Amino acid sequence: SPFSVKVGLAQMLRGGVIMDVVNAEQARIAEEAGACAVMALERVPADIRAQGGVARMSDPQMIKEIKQAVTIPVMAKARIGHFVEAQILEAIGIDYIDESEVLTLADEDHHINKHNFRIPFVCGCRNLGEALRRIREGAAMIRTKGEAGTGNIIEAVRHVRSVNGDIRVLRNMDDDEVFTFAKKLAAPYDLVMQTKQLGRLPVVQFAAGGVATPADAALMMQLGCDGVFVGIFKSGDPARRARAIVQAVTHYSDPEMLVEVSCGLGEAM
Amino acid sequence: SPFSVKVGLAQMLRGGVIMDVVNAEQARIAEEAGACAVMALEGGVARMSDPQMIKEIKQAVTIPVMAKARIGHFVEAQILEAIGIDYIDESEVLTLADEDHHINKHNFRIPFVCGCRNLGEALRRIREGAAMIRTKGEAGTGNIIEAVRHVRSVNGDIRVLRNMDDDEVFTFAKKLAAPYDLVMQTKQLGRLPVVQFAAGGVATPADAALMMQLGCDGVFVGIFKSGDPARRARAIVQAVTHYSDPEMLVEVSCGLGEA
Amino acid sequence: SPFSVKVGLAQMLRGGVIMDVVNAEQARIAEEAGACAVMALERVPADIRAQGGVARMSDPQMIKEIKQAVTIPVMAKARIGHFVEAQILEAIGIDYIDESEVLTLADEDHHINKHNFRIPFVCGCRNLGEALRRIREGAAMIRTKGEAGTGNIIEAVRHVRSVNGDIRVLRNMDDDEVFTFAKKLAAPYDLVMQTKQLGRLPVVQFAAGGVATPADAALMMQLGCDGVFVGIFKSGDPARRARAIVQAVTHYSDPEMLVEVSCGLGEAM
Amino acid sequence: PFSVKVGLAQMLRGGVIMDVVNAEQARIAEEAGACAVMALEGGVARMSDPQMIKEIKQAVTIPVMAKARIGHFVEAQILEAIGIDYIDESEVLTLADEDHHINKHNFRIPFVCGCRNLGEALRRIREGAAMIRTKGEAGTGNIIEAVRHVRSVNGDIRVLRNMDDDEVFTFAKKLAAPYDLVMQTKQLGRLPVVQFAAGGVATPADAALMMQLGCDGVFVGIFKSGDPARRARAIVQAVTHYSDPEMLVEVSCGLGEA
Amino acid sequence: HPFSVKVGLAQVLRGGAIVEVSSVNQAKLAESAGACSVIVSDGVRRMPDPVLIKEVKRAVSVPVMARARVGHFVEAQILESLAVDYIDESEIISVADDDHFINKHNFRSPFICGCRDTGEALRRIREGAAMIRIQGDLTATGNIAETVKNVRSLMGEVRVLNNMDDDEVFTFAKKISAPYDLVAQTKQMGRVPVVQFASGGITTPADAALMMQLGCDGVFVGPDPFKKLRSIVQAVQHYNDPHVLAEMSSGLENA
């Protein structure tokens, strides 16, 4: 199915670090540090929080520029429910669309119908039910989000453990009890069983929220994620830091390497 | 057993004073004043310190070097262990990384220090691997009232446990929500199965001696926040060694300056 | 008993005015005005309240100096429960130790065991039960405290009337009802009966809190206290004021004298 | 004189005190080996008719007790003038003074007082109780509450025994008990007076359980059974051999309906 | 270990029904129907009269159990003296100690204890229970609903634990107020370390077989007894055979 294909397209991101960028230079520094993809937006989450106002899809212009500066995939955020911001991103020719809850919610009751699109979608989640609902709507990739623009990783850890926790519970669960579990999760029974059989999320699952240091990124990988988002430029030296985080994800099970890439990284956010 | 060994490592700190340090300078001033060990660290999220500054400290002094890791941040711990720290402090004074779980400390070769406010919590930390318990009061206030509360709390329950009817210990373990094995082991020894220091608020020689007189094996200090750190540091160190000697306590507290 | 002796030692203070001091000069001005004793501390209660921070035992140095400047007894404050601050004061050779609740409480649940000391203790109280508990712990002298560092005497009056009120109730009480009274007071039955028989506190009882003018001090004496604490230097002219208060306590039942010593005293706190 | 009354009570250790409402029973009780009897006879419940108390005091040779309503010091004056050995100021009778207990020091005869916790025990003692009974539920045949109170008192005593001396002042406050008696209790490592169990003791097993918990004896209200004489003797034997399960099996064997 | 031995004793009861009896007559019937054991019982409910327990023991050759009140360690001393095979510290009779159960490690006789969830079960085992009965309704409600609830809760938590991240097991032990080492053991075995019988409301062959299909090791049971009892024994023995279950239930009389 066209959904099977989108899901496949995301597999190439496993082992990656996606980075937020606000211009070319940054996108170049992001690829130069080894980022598997960049996420274009006119304001980093930390600035969104500290500033306020309404955060919307970024101006195509600044998206076209970024998409011409790098060779790695280019992502862009569309307000939740704003299916027209999406259409515009699709038309612009981006690789992935992030229906992102760090932007200003546009529809309080309904997410974008992502199936109506040929371009893959990333959706945020905080627990297993929320992930399975996003997937049923078409999401090809899931990022379990903690808190955004704080540099604190605690909520990301809570959510990762939440999703992976229930997945493990689900795997060993008595078949006759899964129906009730689906109800309690408020998630489609089909996807629940597909998650049971598979023993994991039927799509790529990244961590996001407060990932500031190499240790943070490696922690997410050891918890069972497929990669991390970083919203790096709010630190002392972006390049060195961005490189260190990339390396941390690639060498997440190697403390000696982790010590190496963490040494004299500069001031974190 | 590996755990027993870690516990043994922490016993070479008894009767000592552990001091927080942020630079090599402070570390020396700390060792110069007779600190048993130094603790490396630098609002805003508080995380493990840069290995760079940790390495510089471990290369300035010949006493054991400790460092903090965020609660539940097992990767930070791994990084500290890989750089040859003597002790890891899974400390609540840093920004909690995991709300529901602590680091599984058994999975490490380096001994851990954990904080606690009561017996049950101390025993849970120990069951997770902790080799040394820090009974923590208030952080960064200079007021020891909370430390006194917790020390009395832990030591109070330990004494209750010592003389308790054996048929009632099961229910007691439940009420503490602590592992029964360790509860009985605590009953037997008549004390905590590991080294116990006090931390939080210790600002004067008298404070430190009070902790020792209550039963603590030693104290943490968080010094340079005083007028003459070198002087205040030595006084506290002497206070801990001569905690039952008023004449001495008067001699080291005299003209200490702004505390 | 050694407790009978400490209690005796305090009898010499009856009819006295104890004054807080922060240095020599003051201690000298306090004795020069006729204070029965001085209380050494590095901050007056009014400043403790207006400033904050943690108020602890004062540095011995500043205590040794004061104790060498005057010939009248010298007191010092030890945080409640801080039995090591006490030990240090005892070793320093002070006359009395005030386990004082104007300093920063060190132990929320237990007062210092005062019997373990050869040096007499003063403890604060607010009612009869609280006084009898302090006494049982070893306190040789009691000061019923109102509010500290406000210059308002209202709470001191409330407490004095409280303690003296129950003492009078206790004296005429049916013997068979005293047990229950002790329970309600939460005070040792022995001391309650000893208070009943005696018709007053079995130890010296001073007033403290908000005593600003001569009239205030004389009021405390007419209510039945044995003397007053003053925390004088926060006024216009300490000397004249300190002298006036001393005289007021000595001539508390003499309005003509009270008018004399109150005239043109300067600005009070 | 108080230390004399206390001694007079220590005699009863290892005994079973049985309720009785007439001579026949008093004899059926002494004949079973009771260490003393307790004379009695909805609706207000008061002291028993002296006559019946004299009929019992002259029918047996073991000590004779009697109940006096809590706070009713005149019911006690009457019991004393009757010449009985022990007065039990008992809460099973209709409370007479809700605020004050009898001043028992004003009496020659020893007093028993009930309690549910250590503070309550120490207060009764300070009022002059020479003996303390930890009471559970009265007249239910259920010992659950007695077990609770026994463990409560013995529990705090063990806590007090090993407690830091400095912290005892505050402990006395929380118990609402006299400091002197608390420190005393801490020194002795037990109640400074004889301590029995009472309430819901129906079977021999119950009686032995109380002893194993650490009581000096038990009260029984046996007569509510199908065969008094047999039951009484069994309970008496149970208290005497409270460590001998093999013995406890015999005395519990076919004792009829409880 | 002496505990391993006790745990080994209870294991012989697997696949069986335990019938509560109140006389030598009922005990004999129960044995004839193939009960693996009988549990003796005679307002406050107490340990049964030792005379009755002796008569039952003599009248049958299957193991004999008897009840003690919760926390009544003397009653348990008595039962162990007259030589019963198992003691059930049973919440069905009147609790004697609201705060503490019997220190079952002080006895040589194996103990059964009740439970309604995994934490409870493990606490009873740490006190020295050699066997656990997962209990529903305390009265004779003939309703199996609460029993099914508590069997599913126990079985379900065990499955959750089996697969749990090792690091998270400490908090899990805290949450269910259970001894960590026993939680760890249960995780390793993918099973509670002792025999586990369903109890409460078992009225029909279908009820009893349901409990077995839910994973229990056996069942306790509280106008034609001989037939009904035989039916339940057969049900437990052939719990996976619907055709047999059908035969067993046919004209069993009023339940």
Curated annotation (Swiss-Prot), chains A, C:
List of catalytic residues: 77
Induction annotation: Not induced by cold, salt, drought or UV stress, or by abscisic acid or jasmonic acid.
Binding positions for D-ribose 5-phosphate per the UniProt entry: 20, 149, 210
Keyword Lyase assigned: yes
Class in the EC hierarchy, top level: lyase
Lineage, highest ranks first: Eukaryota, Viridiplantae, Streptophyta, Embryophyta, Tracheophyta
GO biological process: amino acid metabolic process; chlorophyll metabolic process; hyperosmotic salinity response; pyridoxal phosphate biosynthetic process; response to lipid hydroperoxide; response to non-ionic osmotic stress; response to oxidative stress; response to salt stress
UniProt-listed CDD domains: pdxS (cd04727)
Enzyme Commission identifier(s): 4.3.3.6
Taxonomic superkingdom: Eukaryota
Disruption phenotype: Plants have a lower leaf carotenoid and chlorophyll a and b content, and are impaired both in root cell division and in root cell elongation. Mutant rsr4-1 can be complemented by the addition of any of the vitamin B6 vitamers, except pyridoxal 5'-phosphate.
A GO CC annotation given for this chain: cytosol
InterPro entries according to UniProt: Aldolase_TIM, PdxS/SNZ, PdxS/SNZ_N, RibuloseP-bd_barrel
PROSITE patterns assigned: PDXS_SNZ_1, PDXS_SNZ_2
Pfam families per the UniProt record, alphabetical: SOR_SNZ (PF01680)
Organism of derivation: Arabidopsis thaliana (Mouse-ear cress)
Catalytic activity: aldehydo-D-ribose 5-phosphate + D-glyceraldehyde 3-phosphate + L-glutamine = pyridoxal 5'-phosphate + L-glutamate + phosphate + 3 H2O + H(+)
Classification via NCBIfam families: PRK04180.1 (NF003215), pyridoxal 5'-phosphate synthase lyase subunit PdxS (TIGR00343)
Protein name listed in UniProt: Pyridoxal 5'-phosphate synthase subunit PDX1.3
Keyword Cell inner membrane recorded: no
Molecular function terms from GO: protein heterodimerization activity; protein homodimerization activity; pyridoxal 5'-phosphate synthase (glutamine hydrolysing) activity
From Swiss-Prot, chain E:
Location(s) in or outside the cell: Cytoplasm
GO biological process: pyridoxal phosphate biosynthetic process
Family the UniProt entry places it in: Belongs to the PdxS/SNZ family.
Additional notes on this entry: Unlike PDX1.1 or PDX1.3, PDX1.2 is unable to interact with PDX2 and restore prototrophy in yeast snz1 mutants.
Tissue expression: Expressed in callus tissues, flowers and roots. Weakly expressed in leaves and stems.
Entry keywords, A to Z: Acetylation, Cytoplasm, Pyridoxal phosphate
tRNA-binding keyword on record: no
A GO molecular function held by the record: protein heterodimerization activity
Taxonomy of the source species: Eukaryota, Viridiplantae, Streptophyta, Embryophyta, Tracheophyta
Function: The protein has no function in the formation of pyridoxal 5'-phosphate.
Top-rank taxon, per record: Eukaryota
Gene it is expressed from: PDX12
Keyword Disulfide bond set for record: no
GO cellular component: cytosol
Subunit structure: Homodimer or heterodimer with PDX1.1 or PDX1.3. No interaction with PDX2.
Listed InterPro entries: Aldolase_TIM, PdxS/SNZ, PdxS/SNZ_N, RibuloseP-bd_barrel
Protein name as catalogued: Pyridoxal 5'-phosphate synthase-like subunit PDX1.2
